[PDB]
């Protein structure tokens, strides 16, 4: 999709201290091979008080997105919040929380479901609901969220590709202007790669009590195998090429023109990692801030970008890639152009 | 919002057996008062088997639904799965597992949380998707899915204003035809009511284990404790009445046109319920039906218009309003126009 009107006008990430994947093999809680091969530094990690429940990191964020992009709260015409695990209450509305604390009470509010995608999916949802004439306002406030605790999280161990962070994340989309345009988004999607994410584990009526740890490695092994495909790996390089591709080509944009691109947090460790497949080299990734706060649940994406913003590594004329990708498998991407700073 | 051009291709349900209240309350289940004055009369029951997970059910009721409509499932631009409760397993992607299973492989597909209300507001973010560009397709999916478990929830008791029932329903959009046209939707939303759908829980770094059993009605009393508001029944009149009065007045409709309102599943038994602010009696609503099935997550609008196009409850010409409301507090309305019947 080529956007012909719609802007950022402001983004933000909340994130907790570091803890170092050293202090955790140090504890005998890492594996020091897996800590080698995965190449993950450290990981953002909240304290378990009220105040950092993942609605109210992302209530924190949305604040600092809504105020560095001067909108008023009577002109945000939706909220999304995308998460990937527990919020803290059962049974609730966190995504009501995040729009009362930060915009008010008169405004629609989704919680997103679409794994690590959820942020660079709400995108696509959000431009459109923007430019349907809906809503009188003239902008969405997309926000992510999570915190992840034992027993059921292991944070070093739960996923083989990658180590969980905790925080929150926000960006604020408008149709009026920003300090970067969207120039572009495209999804790619592979829904028969949802097996690797439940592999075979059953469906259980009723949250399985007391909780064992999640291992997320070895359902994708298990969901490999019950799948039975020929081309597995092929479905997952199509899918991302053309997210990459529609991204590139409705922006307008080759990719020796990306200053920057903003990835989701992961890393193989052994042969070719998605910069190849991107066709671009690691420095101009986000692996170096990325391997410092893990995977961030849904807001590896809006966090890259606030950490570019924020240092001036990027400035005016300068397009940035921001690729999604989550289990699914959906992957979206997205063109933005930095028109001030 | 008037909508020029979008419609509901097909609907459909996928219901589990019916269990009754006088059962319930015959194995000490349920109240005797508490039956009564709730006056539903059974919810739907599925069992623990694999084949009824909620992403299952929801997959049976998608197959239904685009089959009705004689739309292909390669135009499906958009799925979207809305749901209350846990879908089977976790840490995984259930709305993926409704679209590969309904659609294919190449639908983008999304879960979607607004509690009651996530079946209606569904409608109006697709209904935006469909018209942006963004997708090849014409057509969108929505589905619902829960099933209800103890020990955390007592589909009885763990609300008070109604009873669970297990099941999935189905609904099809289409920017090119359908059985009926979607002339307007309206949201009326005042998210302060948060508190009262988690009273003084306290934020838990985990899910707490073992789950005792939900009391959402005592929620709501320790909400309104905290929450100390001067105005909260001019709250839920002011949202309910603002999307009543848009989807009727941008469908260009009045209350007495509407031949038949689908409602939430829902009851006081004491004083007005949601048919006298709505302005139409009882009989002009879902609730003979409702009352049948109980409260099936965020499926009782599909579930309720299915009921009526499949035993020619209306007939083309007839107007239709599609009422929401769930914890949030959000209330979404449609008006839709039958055209023809499926």
Redesign the interface.
Known sequence: ?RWENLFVSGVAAWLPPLSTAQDAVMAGLLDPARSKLRGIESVTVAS?A?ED?PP?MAARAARAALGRGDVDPADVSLVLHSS???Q??????????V??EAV????????????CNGGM?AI??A???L????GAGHAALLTTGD?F????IDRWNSVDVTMYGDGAAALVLSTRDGFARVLS?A?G??????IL??GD???????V???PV?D?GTRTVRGAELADLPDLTHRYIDLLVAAKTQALEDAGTAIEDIAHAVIPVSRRGTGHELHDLLGLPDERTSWAYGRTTGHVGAGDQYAGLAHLVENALVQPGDRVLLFGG?????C?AAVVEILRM
């Open positions: 999709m378990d009220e429940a109210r990937l695990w527990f803290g209450i059962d049974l609730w509305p966190a995504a009501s929380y729009a009362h008010g009470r008169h405004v629609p509010a989704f919680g997103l479901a679409q794994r999916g696509e949802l431009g459109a609901y430019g349907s004439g809906i915190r605790a034992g027993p059921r988004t999804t999607v592979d829904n028969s790669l949802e994410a439940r584990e059953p469906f259980a009526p009723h949250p009590e007391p909780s999640a997320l989550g289990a699914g498998y959906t979206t």
